[PDB]
Structure formats: structure tokens, C-alpha cells
């Protein structure tokens, strides 16, 4: 079990850790989050009481260092930082626990939600999508745009998701125009899986990370990316059986976890209706189809 201490909490903010969140008052004695499960990525995120805009936050893995949060009154946001002095850090973390000023990561033992949402998400891949190689952790916020969005303005602050485009030369072999446009299996399996992602686990990992960014920050380009990667699979006639079964599990837990009040913007009607009811894989998402019908029948 690992800990992320907080120097202080100078401004009223709602703090989230993975799917949990806590209200903290201006200059309340909040000094961190303890008992964070080792073995997964995590995200700690923020929404100030005064600006219900710009949700922002940090992806991290505690096996990669000792990390902590400190408010910056110049830049006006809670920043994640690394403490390189291991002894100085255990010292802070033990004094704060003794004084009992830390919340406990509130995991129910029956609950695999976070595992199920992050199964294929690797910290090393996150740091290639969010390039900032002097930190071990990754900042994301509501407003960041993706590389594909940029193409159609500051690249230092971009989400470098893999560009997917159904009407591109990449996606369409000369001479197989109609075949490849109607059956994307070659784009999925040769270009994307074998070519770029190398394996389905990296593909699933980017898909899950895009969903989580859309859920926790309302990042719109991430939502576009999550939907595009679903559609590419659902629009391929030839998909490995293990991918389809795992996709059904992935999507099930994502739909399960979505806030009910956000289904309007986070769920693209056309993609879901095409994937669940018109695509080659209409019959391969039995759990995802069952939870979508019972929870959001309007969208369908």
C-alpha cells in the first residue's frame, strides 16, 4: 500500500482518486491519500469550488517513485511533484498518518471496478500519449486537444493518441476501396494491431485511457478517440475471438461506471447504435448490449 501526501489544501476543491472523490474546504487540514493499491495506474484529479471548469489531474504509478501534491499560488492549481529523498518522504508520510490527517483509498474488497477499467493501461504508454519526459506522472485536463484535432495548436500540451481515420490512404488499400471501406479488418489487424499497436493489449490500453480521460475530465477529443477505437473493431468482419470477448468486458465496465447524468455527451448515438445493432459484431457484445439497453434505452 502506497501514499500520496499533500503539503496543504489552501483552496476549496473536490479531489478525486480513481472513481472516488472527496470535498475539501479552504485551508482544511487535508494531507493526503493512503492505502492506495499497488499494481495499477491511478489518477488524482481536481475541480476547484470556484471554477467548475477545467477539471484537471495526474496519472501516476506508485512503483515509479514517491509522489506528493502541493498547491502553487502563482499558477493556481494543485501540482503533483516527485520527492527524491526517500527518507525525507517516509518521514512526511509517517508524521501525517500518526496525526491521522489522511483519507484511506476506499476500496471495497468485492470490487474489481478499477482493475477492470485499467486492465491494459500501462504507465509507460501513458507517457507517450502525454509527452513530458521530465516527470514520471502525466498531467491531463478538460481543455487539452488531440494530435488529430490539431491537424484539422500548441503541440507540447497535446494528447498524442493514435490517429484513426476511416477515409485515409492508411485505412484503404488501392484497389480494395470498397472492400476495405465496408470491412475494416485489414486496417484493424494489419495496420493497427500488427503494425502500430503490436498487440491487442496496447490497443485496449489506449482505448481504456481515452475513456477514462473523457469520463474524469470531460476531454472531448478523448471521447472521440474511445469511440473511434470501438468502431474500428465493430466494423471489422474478422476479429480474434479473444479480442471480442475482452472488448465486451471492457465496455461493460465503462458503461457501468459512467455517471448517469452524462450519457448525453459522452455516448455517441451513431457509433453505439451501429456497433450494437448494425455492425459485423452486433452479436458479440452481449453484456455491453444488455447494460446499454437497461440503463440508456433512450440513446438507442
Amino acid at each position: 500500500m502506497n501514499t500520496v501526501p499533500f503539503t496543504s489544501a489552501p483552496i476549496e476543491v473536490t479531489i478525486g482518486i480513481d472513481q472516488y472523490s472527496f470535498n475539501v474546504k479552504e485551508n482544511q487540514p487535508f494531507h493526503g491519500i493512503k492505502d492506495i493499491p499497488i499494481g495499477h495506474v491511478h489518477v488524482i484529479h481536481f475541480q476547484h469550488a470556484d471554477n467548475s471548469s477545467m477539471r484537471y489531474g495526474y496519472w501516476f504509478d506508485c512503483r515509479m517513485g514517491n509522489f506528493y501534491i502541493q498547491y502553487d499560488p502563482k499558477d493556481g492549481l494543485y501540482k503533483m511533484m516527485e520527492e527524491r529523498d526517500g527518507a525525507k518522504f517516509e518521514n512526511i508520510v509517517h508524521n501525517f498518518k500518526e496525526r491521522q490527517m489522511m483519507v484511506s483509498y476506499p476500496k471495497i474488497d468485492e470490487d474489481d471496478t478499477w482493475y477492470n477499467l485499467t486492465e491494459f493501461v500501462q504507465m509507460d504508454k501513458i507517457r507517450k500519449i502525454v509527452r513530458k519526459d521530465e516527470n514520471q506522472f502525466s498531467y491531463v485536463d478538460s481543455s487539452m486537444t488531440t494530435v488529430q484535432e490539431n491537424e484539422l495548436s500548441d503541440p507540447a500540451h497535446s494528447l498524442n493518441y493514435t490517429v484513426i481515420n476511416f477515409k485515409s490512404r492508411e485505412a484503404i488499400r488501392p484497389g480494395h476501396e470498397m472492400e476495405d471501406f465496408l470491412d475494416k479488418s485489414y486496417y484493424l489487424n494489419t495496420v493497427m494491431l500488427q503494425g502500430i499497436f503490436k498487440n491487442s493489449s496496447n490497443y485496449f490500453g489506449e482505448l481504456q485511457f481515452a475513456f477514462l480521460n473523457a469520463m474524469f475530465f470531460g476531454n472531448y477529443g478523448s471521447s472521440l478517440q474511445w469511440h473511434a477505437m470501438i468502431e474500428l473493431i465493430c466494423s471489422s468482419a474478422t476479429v480474434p475471438k479473444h479480442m471480442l470477448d475482452k472488448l465486451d468486458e471492457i465496455l461493460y465496465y465503462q458503461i457501468k461506471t459512467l455517471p448517469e447524468q452524462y450519457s448525453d455527451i459522452l455516448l455517441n448515438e451513431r457509433v453505439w447504435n451501429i456497433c450494437l445493432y448494425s455492425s459485423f459484431q452486433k452479436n458479440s457484445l452481449h453484456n455491453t448490449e444488455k447494460i446499454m439497453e437497461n440503463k440508456y434505452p433512450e440513446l438507442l
Binding site: 477515409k167 485515409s168 490512404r169 484503404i172 476501396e177 470498397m178 471501406f181
Partner: protein, 237 residues
């Protein structure tokens, strides 16, 4: 963006553009089989690719052999249209290639877009106009060459005959669309109007009769009258 009444004079500027109509690419007769089921028999079709400024028509004849052994033919027709349009553009010298292609039916956008990926600077556009190019097979000489074809064939025509020696492209296109609108709404009447007078002939190298300017005015009025009557009949107004 889409083509509509507002930006209509863009068709007659000096940017090369083509209309593509696919309505007559896949053509069938429907009949009963011995066991009493319904079956289709394909006949020869055509792609109607027209430069509205110059009248040049690229009539690509679609022979029934194209369809042999193929499924989902109505879907395939759209891709074959786009394949052939893309090959036409490739065959033209660079300075003759269009800067826009306007498809008369929205279902052609994706097939043509995909086939034109090599020409990113050719814009593919839909239109909100209800153009009557389906009636192209009501022009006797076009119907004749389509039905006689024994293999795929490209036949070139000027759909305006020599009209541009005397009138503008705008006026020429309005005449063409009026004639075709009339042929579409009541082919028999429209054709009666065009040929009633045996002393006005169609030149061997032309599609329409050699009317004088004044006779075109009478003709055009007769086509207008035809079109309005048919409307009152359709809707009881």
C-alpha cells in the same frame, strides 16, 4: 459545401467542375419466374458525368457483364460509379481535371471520396438541387448507344449541341434542365413537342433538333406549360 439555389451561378465560372449522376448505372426489369417468384434482369446502364459550363458529357456505359456473380448490386453500383469517375479523372491531363465533383445523390459521397483519396484537392460536394439527369435515357441517341453496347464503352457528346455559339452556359444549362424536367414528368408529351414538326431535324452530330432562336422560345414555353399541368394533376391544385 452543398450546392443549392443560392450559389447556383458558381456552375458557370471558370473553375472546372463535373456533375456525376448514378441513377441509371444499375437498371433492371422486374418479372415473374416459372414458380411464380419475382426476379430481376439487368439491362445496360450508364454514368452521366457532365461539365455544365462546356456541355461536355462523358457517358460511361455500364455493361450488364459487370454485375455477373456479384451480390448487393445496388450498393456495388455506387462503388463502380466512383471507380469509373476516378479513372476518368486519372485519364485527363492535369489542366483538365476538375476542381470539384458534384454528386446528384448523397449516397455517392463516401464511395467517391474513398476512390478520390489520391486527389485531396478535388472537392466532392452534394447538392440540394433536384436535378433531372435521370431522364438522360429519354434522349434517343443516348438510350440507343447504351442499349446497343456489347462491352464497357465511354462515349463522348456535347449535351448542348452548338447552343453555346449563341447563348451562355447559364442559359444553356437552364434549357437542358427544362427539357429534361419535361421528359421526366411526361416523356410522351415532351417528346411529341420536340418532333411534331418534321421539317426541323436533328443533325447527325447532335442530340436535339436544329431549332432557330424563335422556335426555341416556343419550345421552351411548351415545356413550361407541360410541366405545370402535370403538377396540377399530381396534386389536384
Amino acid at each position: 459545401g452543398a450546392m443549392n439555389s443560392s450559389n447556383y451561378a458558381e456552375l458557370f465560372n471558370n473553375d472546372i467542375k463535373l456533375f456525376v449522376d448514378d441513377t441509371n448505372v444499375y437498371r433492371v426489369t422486374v418479372h415473374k419466374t416459372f414458380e411464380g417468384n419475382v426476379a430481376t434482369k439487368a439491362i445496360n446502364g450508364c454514368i452521366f458525368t457532365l461539365n455544365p459550363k462546356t456541355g461536355h458529357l462523358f457517358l460511361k456505359i455500364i455493361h450488364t457483364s459487370v454485375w455477373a456473380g456479384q451480390k448487393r448490386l445496388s450498393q456495388l453500383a455506387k462503388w463502380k460509379t466512383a471507380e469509373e469517375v476516378s479513372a476518368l479523372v486519372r485519364s485527363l491531363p492535369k489542366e483538365e481535371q476538375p476542381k470539384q465533383i458534384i454528386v446528384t445523390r448523397k449516397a455517392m459521397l463516401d464511395p467517391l471520396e474513398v476512390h478520390m483519396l489520391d486527389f485531396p484537392n478535388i472537392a466532392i460536394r452534394p447538392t440540394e438541387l433536384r436535378l433531372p439527369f435521370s431522364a438522360a435515357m429519354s434522349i434517343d441517341k443516348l438510350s440507343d448507344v447504351v442499349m446497343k453496347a456489347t462491352e464497357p464503352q465511354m462515349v463522348l457528346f456535347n449535351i448542348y449541341d452548338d447552343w453555346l455559339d449563341r447563348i451562355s452556359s447559364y442559359t444553356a444549362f437552364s434549357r437542358l434542365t427544362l427539357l429534361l424536367r419535361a421528359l421526366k414528368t411526361n416523356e410522351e408529351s415532351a417528346k411529341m413537342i420536340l418532333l411534331s414538326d418534321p421539317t426541323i431535324t436533328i443533325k447527325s452530330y447532335h442530340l436535339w433538333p436544329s431549332f432557330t432562336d424563335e422556335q426555341w422560345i416556343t419550345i421552351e414555353s411548351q415545356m413550361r406549360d407541360l410541366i405545370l399541368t402535370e403538377y396540377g394533376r399530381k396534386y389536384n391544385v
